[PDB]
Amino acid sequence: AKFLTPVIQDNPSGWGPCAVPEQFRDMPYQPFSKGDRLGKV
């Protein structure tokens, strides 16, 4: 089994993420709940 090293983001200016994850870069942030009722006409 090849151990692939996880990609760690290094932040030289502080503690925490230095960039928005690529999955959310091109998406406007809006909070939603998976429990909200769909089907508004």
């Binding site: 870069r25 091109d26 998406m27 406007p28 809006q30 909070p31 939603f32 709940s33 998976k34 909200d36 009722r37 769909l38 089907g39 508004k40 006409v41």
Partner: protein, 228 residues
């Protein structure tokens, strides 16, 4: 043209042949504007390319899933014509570019609704649900233009039909309840006027509602909707 030809005449099938030429012209204009265009012209062509693709079920992607590649050898030339970029990957690329580059909340709102419709059409319920919930369009759509409301209502019917295809009868019922219980489903989907309301409307409003109707090849059968 496709609002003024009769839906049941052979002439409708003849004018629908030209749709392939329209789709090809839009592709030629897409490639040309990816090299030379501004980001605000690119986001508009991407919306037009999305608009002729989001309702088409990809029978080629489905045929590629129905034949696993067990063992017959023919021609590297038949592979280069099979590298036709999946309607799903093209839809995801064009939509992500709009979400990241669009300065107008309109083009973004049409793109997310077409994206949800295309996931729902392809049985991809979880992706279509999570995009619909993330958008919070349920609260905001009441102030959007009526053609965007017709697109949202058609996307909500398509989500209900997608939930039904996945055996989620409860979530399918919930998504279709308000549309069918209204008694106005034909109008809310832009598929025509109900003859019983012809007696109560101004002829000028009727002439504007007729122009807001979707072409017949974009209709979702009301008998299928009511049966589901």
């Amino acid at each position: 043209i496709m609002q003024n030809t009769d839906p049941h005449s052979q002439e409708y099938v003849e004018h629908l042949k030209d749709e392939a030429q329209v789709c090809a012209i839009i592709e030629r204009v897409q490639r040309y504007l990816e090299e030379k265009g501004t980001t605000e012209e690119i986001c508009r062509v991407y919306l037009r390319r999305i608009l002729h693709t989001y309702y088409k079920f990809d029978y080629k992607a489905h045929q590629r899933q129905l034949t696993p590649p067990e063992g017959s050898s023919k021609s590297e030339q038949d592979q280069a014509e099979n590298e036709g970029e999946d309607s799903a990957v093209l839809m995801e690329r064009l939509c992500k570019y709009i979400y990241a580059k669009d300065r107008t909340d309109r083009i973004r709102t049409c793109a997310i609704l077409c994206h949800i419709y295309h996931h729902a059409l392809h049985s991809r319920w979880y992706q279509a649900r999570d995009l619909m919930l993330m958008s919070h369009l349920q609260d905001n759509i009441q102030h959007a233009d009526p053609p965007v409301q017709i697109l949202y209502n058609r996307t909500m019917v398509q989500l209900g039909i997608c939930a039904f295809r996945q055996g989620l009868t409860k979530d399918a019922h919930n998504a279709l309840l308000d549309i069918q219980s209204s008694g106005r489903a034909k109008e809310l989907l832009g598929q025509g006027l109900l003859l019983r309301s012809l007696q109560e409307r101004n002829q000028e409003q009727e002439k504007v509602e007729r122009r807001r109707q979707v072409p017949f090849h974009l209709h979702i059968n009301l008998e299928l909707l009511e049966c589901v």
